């Protein structure tokens, strides 16, 4: 059977990076050589495998992760990277085997006056394990005084909303990301 990639890339709404979606696909066939030469993708970097020879390999399941970040944070979706996204939102392994696809979505995810639906994790006591998802909204205890779920001093909501306006810079404009990882 064919890989339902149209439901992932051409999806109308993407998830926030702190709650990145994952689509588990069950051993299908797809023309990966068609997706590479598509001008819709401004970022397409594969690690451990070449984009053209993907149709020449087999696997048990291919995982399709999807989220939205700003332009400057696209460089973090790569093995051995650090930052607010790579540490507290989405982390790829150092030995990552797959591809990183991204495209500008200012015409889709930016609203005049700001689209604040997409969020990211700003505070976390430790970095994320590879392919880990942290969706907890517990109040971040920055000091020694506990918070009791009440925002205030030394008590911060661990998430912050992206300010996606059409007039923002490309590094701050929304970029939809899709990561393909394989399982042998």
């Amino acid at each position, epitope marked *: 059977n064919l890989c339902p990639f149209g439901e992932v890339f051409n999806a109308t709404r993407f998830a926030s990076v702190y709650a990145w979606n994952r689509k588990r696909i069950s051993n299908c066939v797809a023309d990966y050589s068609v997706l590479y030469n598509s001008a819709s993708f401004s970022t397409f970097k594969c690690y451990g495998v070449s984009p053209t020879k993907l149709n020449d390999l087999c696997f048990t399941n291919v995982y399709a992760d999807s989220f939205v970040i700003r332009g*400057d*944070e696209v460089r973090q979706i790569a093995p051995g990277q*650090t*930052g*607010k996204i790579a*540490d*507290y939102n989405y982390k790829l392994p150092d030995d990552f085997t797959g591809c990183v696809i991204a495209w500008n979505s200012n015409n889709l995810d930016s609203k005049v006056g700001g689209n604040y639906n997409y969020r990211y994790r*700003l*505070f*976390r*006591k*430790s*970095n994320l394990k590879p392919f880990e998802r942290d969706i907890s909204t517990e109040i*971040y*205890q*920055a*000091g*020694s005084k506990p918070c009791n779920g009440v925002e205030g*001093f*030394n008590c*911060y*909501f661990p998430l*912050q909303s992206y*300010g996606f*306006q059409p*007039t*923002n*810079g490309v590094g*701050y404009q929304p970029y939809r990301v899709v990561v393909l990882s394989f399982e042998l």
Partner: antibody
Amino acid sequence: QVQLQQSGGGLVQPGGSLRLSCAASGITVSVNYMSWVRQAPGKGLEWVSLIFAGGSTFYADSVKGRFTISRDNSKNTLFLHMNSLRLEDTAVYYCARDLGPVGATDYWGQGTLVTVSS
Amino acid sequence: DIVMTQTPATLSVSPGERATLSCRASQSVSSNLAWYQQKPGQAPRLLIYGASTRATGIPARFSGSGSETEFTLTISSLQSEDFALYYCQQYHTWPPMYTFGQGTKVEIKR
């Protein structure tokens, strides 16, 4: 209380090493974004380095390869190891906790001076 | 880096009058800007964050405004304790860094 007491500054010959301390009170260093800001005498403020609560470290292009930020959770003290110092690095160094859009850079250290001469 | 330009470099105001300080960013920083007051020989003190939100314990005479590339710090009635250097700071590049303005010196007019 909320306090960022510093120490370790003084005179250092160009090219040597010097380590600054930033003892924290009430604020946990291992749980916050902790930065190092230096201010050249008579100039503006310049961000030097920053460590994440998760252990990630970032440095400015003017101190890359020469400076190293670290911390000690037992003593609850932020540190900054300065190597290969030159006449540039002569400034008053501050340490501060950063909150971004949740309070900016609210609390600062009192400042320790680093003088580089021969 | 995003360059922050404060105007004027020096502002001579009498006590009780209004002091207005501007700070322009070379690129859009939305509302991610903070203001600080630094007295001689002392560490900076946060006055405004989020372009307009007063920090805890800051008198009501201080107020911030502006967005994107233009920002303003206003002291409605200048007091004798308010004569110091003032710095703006963008933190739209906070995921790692941040930049300050060159500073504005508020001094007693004569």
